[PDB]
RNA sequence: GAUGCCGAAGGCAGGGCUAGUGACUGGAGUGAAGUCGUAACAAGGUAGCCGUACUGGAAGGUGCGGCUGGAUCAC
RNA sequence: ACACCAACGGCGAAAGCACUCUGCUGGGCCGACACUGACACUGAGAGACGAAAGCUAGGGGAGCGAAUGGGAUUAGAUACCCC
RNA sequence: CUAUAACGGUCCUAAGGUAGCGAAAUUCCUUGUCGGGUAAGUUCCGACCCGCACGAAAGGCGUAACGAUCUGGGCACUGUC
RNA sequence: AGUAACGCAAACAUUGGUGAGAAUCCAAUGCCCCGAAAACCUAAGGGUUCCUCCGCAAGGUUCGUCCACGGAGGGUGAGUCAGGGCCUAAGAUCAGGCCGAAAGGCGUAGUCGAUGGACAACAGGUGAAUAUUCCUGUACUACCCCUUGUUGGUCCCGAGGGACGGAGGAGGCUAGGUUAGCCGAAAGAUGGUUAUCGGUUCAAGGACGCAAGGUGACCCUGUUUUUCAGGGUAAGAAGGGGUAGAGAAAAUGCCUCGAGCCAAUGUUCGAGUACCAGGCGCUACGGCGCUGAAGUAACCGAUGCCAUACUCCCAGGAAAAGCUCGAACGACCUUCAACAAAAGGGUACCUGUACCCGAAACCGACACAGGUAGGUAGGUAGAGAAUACCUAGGGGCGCGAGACAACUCUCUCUAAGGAACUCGGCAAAAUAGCCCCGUAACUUCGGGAGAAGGGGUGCCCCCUCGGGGGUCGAAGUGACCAGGCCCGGGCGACUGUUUACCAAAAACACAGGUCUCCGCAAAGUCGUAAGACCAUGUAUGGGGGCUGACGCCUGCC
RNA sequence: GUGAAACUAAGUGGAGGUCCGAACCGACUGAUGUUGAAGAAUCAGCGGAUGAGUUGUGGUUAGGGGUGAAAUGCCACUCG
RNA sequence: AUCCCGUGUGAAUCAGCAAGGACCACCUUGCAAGGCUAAAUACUCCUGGGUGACCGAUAGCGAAGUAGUACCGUGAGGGA
């Protein structure tokens, strides 16, 4: 399950460093900072190298995502990491291509997938690399396919069209019990580089739209508000006309 | 544990001239205005914080 | 004579068991006659009963399952 | 959830179990002497199973439907009836 | 029998405070009344409810551990007296 | 107003000396203080304060013959120590490029940037002021020089490596220390005594070497599995070789060879006519010349070394160069040209280097009861880097002398009482270590708990490896050090955080809960824009709002 | 212990925003100080002390801003 | 009106076109959508002459001597 190897060439130290500071150096994404140093594992999301026979040597921990990751070999000797599929065991064999068996960890275009399958690691764009359903226990069913377009039900529940020529991988993503963890203490959050958050109602009127009333503030604001002055609850922020809209059918519920 | 007045501590001259030093005033436009301004008043020393890269005053 | 060991009351301390008592409060029983209703016994006027959950001033009501110690009709 | 089959029928220790199929498996009964030769019956404590409702955690949610709301009925209706 | 009101009538609203708690960090009148602790108690603990003006995620009610917390009492101890 | 004060309550004293002048300057003898510093050294900083001679106007909280003050004259020596001639992190600048009234903003290669990687030196001596720098010994890097051996080497490129956490304990060791043994000296006016006092040191480096250490697969039998003993298995460890695929090396797959390997430390050289107790002689009585005995052993024992060695954990633990290896592609250079080796000789870039640095020299306007990273870590008691008393080493606080009123402050003690004090037991006093017995309600079953409460404790002999006997004292963890506890309630679950300099809490945070947004050219945030963050992430994820562990719940409009 | 499992002494193990306590970080109470020895200290006590720890060096964020476990706190004795 | 600009439409060549303070007629005046040009005018970090009902060391320049010095400030800056 978890045993540390030496470092394969896939593990580097190069990275953005200030978390949540942009160019201007300002904090943009709040609450980050602190927390253990990490190294970047170079995942292979594309899986674009076709028609060679890959073998899972080990299963390893990754700090960066909550899934697991597998070191896989080839006969050619190239080594990649892949996301760990759910139920896959060391010694297993995987392959990507067009005409391929359908089993755990194999990767194929959506032209060749039998309907009803459970998929992860889904490209929305040809050769761009896999994007959708990359987290622990995440999975998406391929419900129907018609014309040049295939239909999925994403782990958010949202049903959406994508291209039939985009690669994807069978099997759900491993390490399913990760959200069953209970951190138990403050320190355990801080280890993840997630700093403490101050409730709006608490800060002074200059600092935030629910500002100090005398004793304890109900929010008098006629509405719950962002730090920046927008309605906090149920105001849809999706760009009205965004290009994706023809593709999206039912919205997550 | 140290008094408020202690704002100026012992700090490596290297670090200071990497802040107020000469070669830094030369970078920005506003700095060049600085140096024209000081030359106008005609001060004996243009950059107070400065430092030899190597020499008797050198910080390693 | 002195002294060591063991030594009863006496002292302190926490325990176990029981006696009495206590502002207030929960129900039980008997009071012809009071109030509110009419749940049960006839198909008791929505069939009844058992377990159980929710709710109702109160007897209760409904749900889910079970049984006939159910009438009417089927024989 | 499984019409007809369904029956005063079958199996199960009881609870229960029924569209169809296949696989793993528990018993029951019957006919033979093939064999052991009383190894039996019950059971304090103890164990396992145990309708429905209920609860914890995660899913799922069409119909039905406690609670709840409206409409009536009624002296009243926190019920029967309806949505 | 004095009392109180499970019960009914009426008014008005979008609807009229349920569980639980309650003289409270909330109680004005007020040192409420009762019980306890003290020789004596405006504080303290338990309870009553007549909640000026508790109340259910501006959470309600419990709660072991914890606190240079706030608040009452007791033994030891002392120039605090 | 000739008033307050003269900057801690470590403490001075006397005899000489210099001098016009001495509580204050020098020396001697005592006494006292620090000793996880008030000691020695190094980073930063300061900038000549360092040393010598002269001076005593001002400075110095008094004095002053003195000085961190003033005047003159000196002083810092490196192939190896620290930086640069090497490499990259955060970060910075950024050719071209994108955007922008201008100034400029973003950003790629590049280039900067140590607090990190890489890389070679130690002992003794001299010494008014420097010493891993100068001198004498042995060392070591990098170049050049010759001999020999090969013919292609060099860069670009492909690779291996460099290269990495926390916690825990067990080893194996040294550094230090203590006691013996050896050697030398000793009479220190006392009742006794030599039981006393000193010495017993040596580095980097080079050769060797490694078990009772640590690691080296499985199976059977026993030793508690372990340290072990017999057998067997056939790569089964460091470590090597071969092959195969587009395939040099590498990675990867198959085949094969190897029972040892690891590294602190240790032995030997270095290393003795070094160093040194004393001994002899001179005294400008400051210091100096001369000769030198022994130089081993045992037991304590690290927080240092092996060591990124193990075992466990989740929060999963830098990059690049030097270094090792290597075909094709490109560029350049080519014969006494280049590269490869073991000897031998030779050769040796800048800058820092004084002094102070738990400070009268830095930072606090002061010669200010303060702040300031790192290194080294002796004795007796002690669990200890606490405390107490000491060594090495350094100091006696830059005003004294008296007298001994009130009063204020820092402290000791107080008859009888014991919270009567007071807003309030505020402040004091009390308790305390170790071993033994004992230990409640309540509970989330972890706790509560060192609950409470009790006993024992010194010094001698005797027994077993704790028990008995004696004996002092008013008192035995006799000093220092070192918990007061119990019963209730409110608030907040908890450790945490906070108003630098009047508030540390019941405020904030929190694990947990729940609502809403967001399908990746995401939502959100920052920018005029380019773009940046979010994220090299992808709904078990990212925003935002309220509440705040766990338990029971969360009603109506 | 049963056939599987549960349950319970034992040893080993060495978890912990565990405990006591120096260094170190703080700043709870008192006393002194108030033309201070000091523009926030000394004295005696006091809290944390393997962590949401402390600190060094070198960096980042800048005023229609920044940062904030949120006090209008902090941004060179200056901060609605 | 004249003049000059963003977005959009968009003419006429001298029998034309523009101006004459909405606009139209008539007359008068002029020839946009290409450039360049001296003098009279503004000023004093200064240079050379001249004058002063200007100062005379608290004045006159901040500065009659180390003056943008000493000193203060991290720095911009203050400044005898
Ligand atoms: Mg790595
Ligand atoms: Mg590597
Ligand atoms: Mg920047
Ligand atoms: Mg939260
Ligand atoms: Mg919060
Ligand atoms: Mg506030
Ligand atoms: Mg902000
Ligand atoms: Mg506002
Ligand atoms: Mg408000
Ligand atoms: Mg209020
Ligand atoms: Mg200066
Ligand atoms: Mg007795
Ligand atoms: Mg008793
Ligand atoms: Mg009653
Ligand atoms: Mg009754
Ligand atoms: Mg009666
Ligand atoms: Mg009835
Ligand atoms: Mg009935
Ligand atoms: Mg009946
Ligand atoms: Mg009902
Ligand atoms: Mg109903
Ligand atoms: Mg029924
Ligand atoms: Mg039967
Ligand atoms: Mg059925
Ligand atoms: Mg069968
Ligand atoms: Mg027989
Ligand atoms: Mg029985
Ligand atoms: Mg059961
Ligand atoms: Mg059920
Ligand atoms: Mg319920
Ligand atoms: Mg459920
Ligand atoms: Mg429904
Ligand atoms: Mg219905
Ligand atoms: Mg109704
Ligand atoms: Mg509704
Ligand atoms: Mg009605
Ligand atoms: Mg009456
Ligand atoms: Mg009514
Ligand atoms: Mg009524
Ligand atoms: Mg009515
Ligand atoms: Mg109405
Ligand atoms: Mg309504
Ligand atoms: Mg209504
Ligand atoms: Mg009520
Ligand atoms: Mg009720
Ligand atoms: Mg009550
Ligand atoms: Mg009262
Ligand atoms: Mg309350
Ligand atoms: Mg009230
Ligand atoms: Mg009152
Ligand atoms: Mg009484
Ligand atoms: Mg009373
Ligand atoms: Mg009182
Ligand atoms: Mg009360
Ligand atoms: Mg109210
Ligand atoms: Mg409230
Ligand atoms: Mg509310
Ligand atoms: Mg609350
Ligand atoms: Mg409590
Ligand atoms: Mg605390
Ligand atoms: Mg006692
Ligand atoms: Mg007194
Ligand atoms: Mg006078
Ligand atoms: Mg006077
Ligand atoms: Mg006087
Ligand atoms: Mg005086
Ligand atoms: Mg004074
Ligand atoms: Mg003094
Ligand atoms: Mg001492
Ligand atoms: Mg000193
Ligand atoms: Mg020194
Ligand atoms: Mg230095
Ligand atoms: Mg000088
Ligand atoms: Mg001197
Ligand atoms: Mg003088
Ligand atoms: Mg003087
Ligand atoms: Mg003289
Ligand atoms: Mg001098
Ligand atoms: Mg960089
Ligand atoms: Mg730039
Ligand atoms: Mg450019
Ligand atoms: Mg770059
Ligand atoms: Mg450099
Ligand atoms: Mg360095
Ligand atoms: Mg070096
Ligand atoms: Mg170098
Ligand atoms: Mg010296
Ligand atoms: Mg030397
Ligand atoms: Mg030398
Ligand atoms: Mg030598
Ligand atoms: Mg060499
Ligand atoms: Mg390379
Ligand atoms: Mg490192
Ligand atoms: Mg050890
Ligand atoms: Mg030794
Ligand atoms: Mg001895
Ligand atoms: Mg002897
Ligand atoms: Mg004698
Ligand atoms: Mg001796
Ligand atoms: Mg050696
Ligand atoms: Mg050699
Ligand atoms: Mg061995
Ligand atoms: Mg090869
Ligand atoms: Mg080959
Ligand atoms: Mg190989
Ligand atoms: Mg030993
Ligand atoms: Mg330690
Ligand atoms: Mg250390
Ligand atoms: Mg490790
Ligand atoms: Mg070539
Ligand atoms: Mg070679
Ligand atoms: Mg030197
Ligand atoms: Mg030196
Ligand atoms: Mg002094
Ligand atoms: Mg001082
Ligand atoms: Mg000091
Ligand atoms: Mg010691
Ligand atoms: Mg002790
Ligand atoms: Mg000892
Ligand atoms: Mg000490
Ligand atoms: Mg001494
Ligand atoms: Mg005196
Ligand atoms: Mg006196
Ligand atoms: Mg007394
Ligand atoms: Mg007495
Ligand atoms: Mg007494
Ligand atoms: Mg008493
Ligand atoms: Mg009292
Ligand atoms: Mg009193
Ligand atoms: Mg009194
Ligand atoms: Mg006290
Ligand atoms: Mg005391
Ligand atoms: Mg006493
Ligand atoms: Mg004791
Ligand atoms: Mg004592
Ligand atoms: Mg016991
Ligand atoms: Mg209990
Ligand atoms: Mg316990
Ligand atoms: Mg308690
Ligand atoms: Mg105990
Ligand atoms: Mg005790
Ligand atoms: Mg207790
Ligand atoms: Mg005792
Ligand atoms: Mg005792
Ligand atoms: Mg005794
Ligand atoms: Mg005897
Ligand atoms: Mg005895
Ligand atoms: Mg005695
Ligand atoms: Mg005794
Ligand atoms: Mg104490
Ligand atoms: Mg203690
Ligand atoms: Mg309490
Ligand atoms: Mg209560
Ligand atoms: Mg109260
Ligand atoms: Mg708290
Ligand atoms: Mg604690
Ligand atoms: Mg802080
Ligand atoms: Mg404060
Ligand atoms: Mg603070
Ligand atoms: Mg506090
Ligand atoms: Mg706060
Ligand atoms: Mg976006
Ligand atoms: Mg979510
Ligand atoms: Mg969130
Ligand atoms: Mg709250
Ligand atoms: Mg709650
Ligand atoms: Mg509970
Ligand atoms: Mg142990
Ligand atoms: Mg702790
Ligand atoms: Mg203790
Ligand atoms: Mg305070
Ligand atoms: Mg203190
Ligand atoms: Mg402490
Ligand atoms: Mg304490
Ligand atoms: Mg404590
Ligand atoms: Mg502690
Ligand atoms: Mg820990
Ligand atoms: Mg750090
Ligand atoms: Mg700090
Ligand atoms: Mg803060
Ligand atoms: Mg300033
Ligand atoms: Mg400030
Ligand atoms: Mg303020
Ligand atoms: Mg015109
Ligand atoms: Mg005009
Ligand atoms: Mg016009
Ligand atoms: Mg314009
Ligand atoms: Mg035209
Ligand atoms: Mg004209
Ligand atoms: Mg024209
Ligand atoms: Mg025009
Ligand atoms: Mg023109
Ligand atoms: Mg022009
Ligand atoms: Mg004058
Ligand atoms: Mg003047
Ligand atoms: Mg004059």
Checking each nucleotide's C1' against the CA of B43, the nearest proves to be: H68
Question: B5 and B11 in contact (C-beta within 8 Å)?
Answer: no
Strand G contact with A23 (CB < 7 A) = no
Residue A161 DSSP symbol: E
CA–centroid distance, A192 to ligand 25, in Å, is 58
Q: CA A153 from chain center: how many Å? A: 16
Question: A52 and A76 in contact (C-beta within 8 Å)?
Answer: yes
Half-sphere exposure of A187 (CA within 13 A, CB side): 0
- In chain A, where are the structural domains located? 1-95, 96-253
Please name the residues in contact with B37: beta carbons below 8 A apart, sequence gap of 6 or more: none
Q: What is the dihedral of CA B36, B42, B45, B50, to 10 degrees?
A: 0
Q: Is A77 left (phi over 0), alpha (psi -120 to 50) or beta?
A: left
CA–centroid distance, A195 to ligand 171, in Å, is 28
d(CA A248, CA A253): 14
Checking each nucleotide's C1' against the CA of A247, the nearest proves to be: F519
Helix (H) or strand (E) holding B33: helix B29-41
Closest CA to A74 of A43, A97, A49: A49
Q: CB atoms < 10 A from the CB of B22, how many?
A: 14
Residue A72 backbone dihedrals phi, psi, to 5 degrees:
-120, 145
d(CA A212, CA A204): 5
Question: A191 and A35 in contact (C-beta within 8 Å)?
Answer: yes
Question: B20 and B51 in contact (C-beta within 8 Å)?
Answer: no
Q: What is the resolution of this structure in A?
A: 3.4
Token pair listed for A88: 């896959």
> What's the CA A34/C1' F550 distance, rounded, in angstroms?
29
- 3-class DSSP state of A177: helix
CA–centroid distance, A103 to ligand 51, in Å, is 85
Within 7 Å of a protein beta carbon, the nucleotides of strand E are 58-59
CATH number of this structure's domain A1-95, picked from the four choices 2.40.50.140, 3.40.50.970, 1.20.1050.10, 3.40.50.300: 2.40.50.140
Please name the residues in contact with A101: beta carbons below 8 A apart, sequence gap of 6 or more: none
Token pair listed for A3: 């045993």
Question: A249 and A151 in contact (C-beta within 8 Å)?
Answer: yes
Q: Is A252 left (phi over 0), alpha (psi -120 to 50) or beta?
A: beta
Helix (H) or strand (E) holding A73: strand A69-73
Checking each nucleotide's C1' against the CA of A217, the nearest proves to be: E58
Closest CA to A139 of A85, A89, A95: A85
d(CA A219, CA A227): 13
Question: A60 and A71 in contact (C-beta within 8 Å)?
Answer: yes
Which three-class secondary structure string do you get for A193-224? CECCCCCHHHCCCCCCCCCCCCCCCCCCCCCC
Token pair listed for A179: 């959200």
CA–centroid distance, A121 to ligand 125, in Å, is 88
Strand G contact with B8 (CB < 7 A) = yes
Checking each nucleotide's C1' against the CA of A28, the nearest proves to be: F525
Question: A29 and A197 in contact (C-beta within 8 Å)?
Answer: no
> What's the CA B56/C1' F287 distance, rounded, in angstroms?
39
Residue A180 backbone dihedrals phi, psi, to 5 degrees:
-85, -10
> What's the CA B57/C1' F119 distance, rounded, in angstroms?
27
Token pair listed for A50: 């076709």
Please name the residues in contact with A48: beta carbons below 8 A apart, sequence gap of 6 or more: A96, A127, A167
> What's the CA A58/C1' F223 distance, rounded, in angstroms?
40
Burial track A38-58 (b if 16+ CB lie within 10 A, e otherwise): eeebebbbbbeeeeeebbbee
Triad A191, A138, A197: Cα angle to 5°? 35
Output residues with Cβ under 7 Å from nucleic strand H.
B 7-8, 16, 20, 34, 37-38, 41-45, 47-49
Which technique was used to obtain these atomic coordinates? Answer: cryo-EM
Token pair 């670090």 is at which residue?
Answer: B15
Checking each nucleotide's C1' against the CA of A215, the nearest proves to be: E58
Among positive and negative, which fits the CA dihedral A232, A234, A239, A240? negative
Triad A32, A34, A40: Cα angle to 5°? 80
Q: Is A244 left (phi over 0), alpha (psi -120 to 50) or beta?
A: alpha
**Fold classified for B1-60:** Helix Hairpins (1.10.287)
Question: B33 and B39 in contact (C-beta within 8 Å)?
Answer: no
Strand G contact with B7 (CB < 7 A) = yes
- In chain B, where are the structural domains located? 1-60
Token pair listed for A224: 């719950």
CA–centroid distance, A59 to ligand 133, in Å, is 71
């Amino acid at each position: 399950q978890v045993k540390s190897n030496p470092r394969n060439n896939l593990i580097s130290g190069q990275r953005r460093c200030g978390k949540g500071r942009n160019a201007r150096g300002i904090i943009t994404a709040r609450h980050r900072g602190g927390g253990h140093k990490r190294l970047y594992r170079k995942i292979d999301f594309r899986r674009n190298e076709k028609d060679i026979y890959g073998k899972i040597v080990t299963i390893e921990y990754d700090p960066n995502r909550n899934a697991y990751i597998c070191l896989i070999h080839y006969g050619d000797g190239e080594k990649r990491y892949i996301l760990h599929p759910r139920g896959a065991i060391i010694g297993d064999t995987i392959v990507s291509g067009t005409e391929v068996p359908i089993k755990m960890g194999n990767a194929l275009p959506l032209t060749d997938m039998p309907l009803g399958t459970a998929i992860h690691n889904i490209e929305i764009t040809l050769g761009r690399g896999g994007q959708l359903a990359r987290a622990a226990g995440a999975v998406a069913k391929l419900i129907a396919k018609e014309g040049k377009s295939a239909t999925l039900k994403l782990p958010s529940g949202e049903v959406r069209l994508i291209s039939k020529n985009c690669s994807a991988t069978v099997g759900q993503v491993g390490n399913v019990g990760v959200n069953q963890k209970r951190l138990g203490r403050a320190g355990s959050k801080r280890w993840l580089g997630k700093r403490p958050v101050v409730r709006g109602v608490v800060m002074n009127p200059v600092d935030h739209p629910h500002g100090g009333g005398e004793g304890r503030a109900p929010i008098g604001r006629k509405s719950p508000t962002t730090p920046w002055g927008y309605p906090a609850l149920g105001r849809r922020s999706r760009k009205r006309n965004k290009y994706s809209d023809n593709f999206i059918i039912r919205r997550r519920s | 544990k140290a008094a408020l007045c202690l704002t100026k501590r012992s700090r490596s001259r290297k670090s200071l001239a990497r802040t107020h030093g000469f070669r830094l005033r030369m970078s920005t436009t506003s700095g060049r205005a600085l140096l024209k301004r000081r030359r106008a008043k005609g001060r004996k020393i243009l950059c107070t914080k400065t430092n030899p890269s190597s020499g008797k005053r050198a910080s390693p």
